[PDB]
Ligand binder design. Structure first.
Ligand SMILES: *[C@@H]1O[C@H](CO)[C@@H](O[C@@H]2O[C@H](CO)[C@@H](O[C@@H]3O[C@H](CO[C@H]4O[C@H](CO[C@H]5O[C@H](CO)[C@@H](O)[C@H](O)[C@@H]5O[C@H]5O[C@H](CO)[C@@H](O)[C@H](O)[C@@H]5O)[C@@H](O)[C@H](O[C@H]5O[C@H](CO)[C@@H](O)[C@H](O)[C@@H]5O[C@H]5O[C@H](CO)[C@@H](O)[C@H](O)[C@@H]5O)[C@@H]4O)[C@@H](O)[C@H](O[C@H]4O[C@H](CO)[C@@H](O)[C@H](O)[C@@H]4O[C@H]4O[C@H](CO)[C@@H](O)[C@H](O)[C@@H]4O[C@H]4O[C@H](CO)[C@@H](O)[C@H](O)[C@@H]4O)[C@@H]3O)[C@H](O)[C@H]2NC(C)=O)[C@H](O)[C@H]1NC(C)=O
Ligand SMILES: *[C@@H]1O[C@H](CO)[C@@H](O[C@@H]2O[C@H](CO)[C@@H](O[C@@H]3O[C@H](CO[C@H]4O[C@H](CO)[C@@H](O)[C@H](O)[C@@H]4O)[C@@H](O)[C@H](O[C@H]4O[C@H](CO)[C@@H](O)[C@H](O)[C@@H]4O)[C@@H]3O)[C@H](O)[C@H]2NC(C)=O)[C@H](O)[C@H]1NC(C)=O
Ligand SMILES: *[C@@H]1O[C@H](CO)[C@@H](O[C@@H]2O[C@H](CO)[C@@H](O[C@@H]3O[C@H](CO)[C@@H](O)[C@H](O[C@H]4O[C@H](CO)[C@@H](O)[C@H](O)[C@@H]4O)[C@@H]3O)[C@H](O)[C@H]2NC(C)=O)[C@H](O)[C@H]1NC(C)=O
Ligand SMILES: *[C@@H]1O[C@H](CO)[C@@H](O[C@@H]2O[C@H](CO)[C@@H](O[C@@H]3O[C@H](CO)[C@@H](O)[C@H](O)[C@@H]3O)[C@H](O)[C@H]2NC(C)=O)[C@H](O)[C@H]1NC(C)=O
Ligand SMILES: *[C@@H]1O[C@H](CO)[C@@H](O[C@@H]2O[C@H](CO)[C@@H](O)[C@H](O)[C@H]2NC(C)=O)[C@H](O)[C@H]1NC(C)=O
Ligand SMILES: *[C@@H]1O[C@H](CO)[C@@H](O[C@@H]2O[C@H](CO)[C@@H](O)[C@H](O)[C@H]2NC(C)=O)[C@H](O)[C@H]1NC(C)=O
Ligand SMILES: *[C@@H]1O[C@H](CO)[C@@H](O)[C@H](O)[C@H]1NC(C)=O
Ligand SMILES: *[C@@H]1O[C@H](CO)[C@@H](O)[C@H](O)[C@H]1NC(C)=O
Ligand code: NA
Ligand code: NA
Length: 392
């Protein structure tokens, strides 16, 4: 019986959960817009993939507190990103990327939703902004000071003058989780019970879609069987998902089940209609409008190169060539212990753009989901730790 895989102060499983020994790497890839003026004149966008920009992660748990006679545990998961120049295609503090002006699109979308409408319209009218802007990779990723945000900031101090895809996400966590250890049962090991105090979400339509299912995805319950389905809640993705068995794999000298994210997760279906806000009206198979949880910005999640998506999402942006092996999302789990031996968590950030008559910033741009940057967050078990695990 494997009941030593339980988060108790004394077991080695707890120490690995507290301080993950395996290094995790996130790699950023950007889409450099080659014809901005022609896009504003209503022509088909043309982009170039640029990457990787590889960062090593520093993971740990903090504010660790037990409870309920040892059945529950609460903590926060801090995550930092240390840059690796030699594992990267270039220096991000020099390498420039030309892409959409996300701050102006954000505040344009705010104004259309009547949030600081007069102030935004006034500033935009006085200070002309460009729809396409060029910044360094370090700026786009970890923040830069924007004009319009700075002007709004003087009127509304709560509004940040700086914008970045991962702004202030270095050396920080993503809410206060409370997990469930495997004391009551091994099946509900590292299972999330609440997040930021609440037992479920409240920005999707159906109660079904707002449920917090499964684990964070850093580990799974022991003794996994081929037939079952594993639920994951990635906070950044703003919904629970699930992964199904694909095929058999061996990592080092260890057995592993290859579990992937299936097409059903972002499919245009009734099960996923609840995610399509407001009136159950969806953009199409293979995307997720996450504007509600990204503070009103017109941000659309997808898989890299619109993998597992409607063909028209690929035809809209010249430069998207999706294949399985490069863009799928998979995880190799040791069935016995439920430990991730290898994985590639991959997702893409897009921006919803459309022509506006009230705005000449938009020109005559087409209505489309415009890709900005996607990543590969990956892990791989090394020989020393694998051989350590192999013994048990
Ligand atoms: C992704 O995802 C995301 C999320 O999820 C999303 O998002 C979304 O989006 C959408 C888009 O569309 C949106 O929707 C929109 O919204 C907007 C906004 O809203 C808001 O606001 C408003 C306004 O307010 C203001 O005003 C008023 C009056 O007017 C007042 O009352 C107030 O107070 C304010 O005022 C202020 O300010 C101003 C400035 O100027 C000044 O002046 C003054 O003094 C003051 O200060 C409002 O209205 C709203 O409200 C609502 O809601 C709430 C909640 O809480 C409630 O409570 C209320 O009651 C309401 O509700 C109700 O009503 C409404 C009506 O409006 C309705 O809607 C409902 O159902 C109910 O019944 C808010 O707050 C808006 O604006 C819009 O609306 C529009 O559109 C629609 C369509 O859908 C319709 O339905 C409506 O009706 C409208 O329409 C109209 O208008 C327009 C413009 O102008 C036009 O064009 C048309 O034609 C029409 O017109 C007509 O009618 C009218 C009546 O209405 C009249 O007046 C005239 O004459 C004509 O006849 C819409 O709705 C949303 O919101 C969002 N959400 C979020 C969360 O974000 C997105 O989308 C996605 N994406 C993708 C791509 O997919
Ligand atoms: C994180 O995620 C990214 C992907 O999103 C990974 O990066 C990719 O890594 C794979 C390998 O793991 C790379 O694949 C290799 O690409 C090489 C270049 O291919 C070019 O040329 C061919 C024609 O020759 C074109 O078809 C293609 O479009 C490219 O323009 C290939 O030479 C390699 O081929 C070898 O493997 C294939 C397997 O299918 C064999 O069939 C071949 O015979 C050959 O042996 C290979 O396909 C891919 O290019 C990478 N892309 C990017 C953007 O980096 C990361 O590796 C991943 N994980 C980690 C941990 O980093
Ligand atoms: C993504 O696309 C964007 C836009 O196409 C691209 O930005 C551009 O990069 C080029 C270089 O690739 C920049 O051109 C340089 O401008 C600087 C500043 O004035 C000059 O110092 C440079 O002059 C030297 O260039 C060569 C040596 O580096 C020599 O041939 C020459 O004699 C000079 O010594 C050079 O002209 C250009 O400024 C930007 N454009 C914008 C709008 O920012 C970006 O590089 C692409 N990103 C990636 C990762 O490829
Ligand atoms: C969070 O977890 C719950 C429970 O695991 C998920 O809800 C379940 O979703 C399944 C989808 O297969 C529902 O199955 C249904 O079966 C009937 C026939 O019996 C079929 O006609 C339907 O089309 C559907 O497939 C099931 O009812 C439902 N169970 C419960 C208790 O809600 C939910 O999807 C998960 N949410 C997220 C966001 O991951
Ligand atoms: C995120 O924060 C971490 C932790 O401070 C940074 O990692 C350090 O970077 C310094 C640069 O001065 C280096 O000396 C070390 O590689 C790191 N220190 C430690 C203790 O790990 C990381 O660079 C930050 N990332 C970004 C993008 O700013
Ligand atoms: C996603 O699926 C829905 C439901 O099938 C589509 O809505 C249907 O569209 C067809 C024609 O394309 C109509 O005949 C039906 O009457 C529609 N049914 C409902 C309930 O709306 C919707 O068009 C699809 N969305 C996309 C972007 O392809
Ligand atoms: C766990 O180990 C021992 C318990 O006696 C103690 O030294 C340490 O402070 C404990 N830490 C946590 C986070 O429980
Ligand atoms: C998890 O543990 C067991 C096994 O599934 C189950 O009986 C219990 O209700 C679950 N607890 C929670 C909080 O989900
Ligand atoms: Na409304
Ligand atoms: Na316009």
């Amino acid at each position: 019986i494997e009941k030593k895989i339980v988060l108790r102060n004394g077991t080695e499983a707890f120490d690995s959960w507290e301080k993950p020994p395996l290094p995790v790497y996130t790699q950023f890839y950007f889409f450099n817009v080659t014809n901005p003026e022609e896009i504003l004149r209503g022509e088909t966008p043309r982009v170039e993939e640029v990457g990787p920009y590889t960062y090593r992660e520093l993971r740990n748990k903090a504010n660790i507190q037990f409870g309920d006679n040892g059945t529950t545990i609460s903590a926060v998961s801090n995550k930092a990103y240390v840059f690796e120049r030699d594992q990267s295609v270039g220096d991000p503090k020099i390498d420039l990327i030309r892409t959409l002006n996300i701050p102006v699109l954000t505040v344009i979308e705010w104004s259309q939703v009547h949030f600081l409408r007069e102030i935004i319209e006034a500033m935009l009218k006085a200070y002309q902004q460009k729809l396409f802007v060029t910044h360094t990779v370090d700026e786009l990723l970890w923040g830069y000071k924007d004009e319009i945000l700075s002007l709004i900031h003087v009127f509304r101090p709560d509004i940040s003058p700086y914008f970045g895809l991962f702004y202030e996400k270095n050396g920080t966590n993503d809410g206060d989780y409370v997990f469930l250890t495997g004391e009551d049962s091994y099946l509900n090991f590292t299972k999330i019970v609440e997040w930021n105090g609440k037992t479920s979400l409240d920005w999707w339509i159906t109660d079904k879609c707002n449920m917090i299912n499964g684990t964070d995805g850093d580990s799974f319950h022991p003794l996994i069987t081929k037939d079952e389905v594993l639920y994951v809640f990635p906070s950044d993705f703003c919904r629970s998902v699930y992964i199904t068995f694909s095929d058999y794999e061996s990592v080092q000298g260890l057995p592993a089940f290859r579990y992937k994210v299936p097409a059903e997760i972002l499919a245009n279906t009734s099960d996923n209609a609840g995610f399509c806000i407001p009136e159950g009206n969806c953009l199409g198979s293979g995307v997720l409008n996450v504007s509600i949880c990204k503070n009103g910005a017109p941000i659309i999640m997808s898989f890299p190169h619109f993998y597992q998506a409607d063909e028209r999402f690929v035809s809209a942006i010249e430069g998207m060539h999706p294949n399985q092996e490069d863009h799928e999302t998979f995880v190799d789990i040791n069935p016995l212990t439920g430990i991730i031996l290898k994985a590639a968590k991959r997702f893409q950030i897009n921006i919803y753009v459309k022509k506006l008559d009230d705005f000449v910033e938009t020109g005559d741009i087409r209505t489309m989901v415009f890709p900005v940057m996607y990543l590969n967050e990956s892990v791989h078990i090394d020989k020393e730790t694998a051989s350590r695990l192999k013994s048990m």
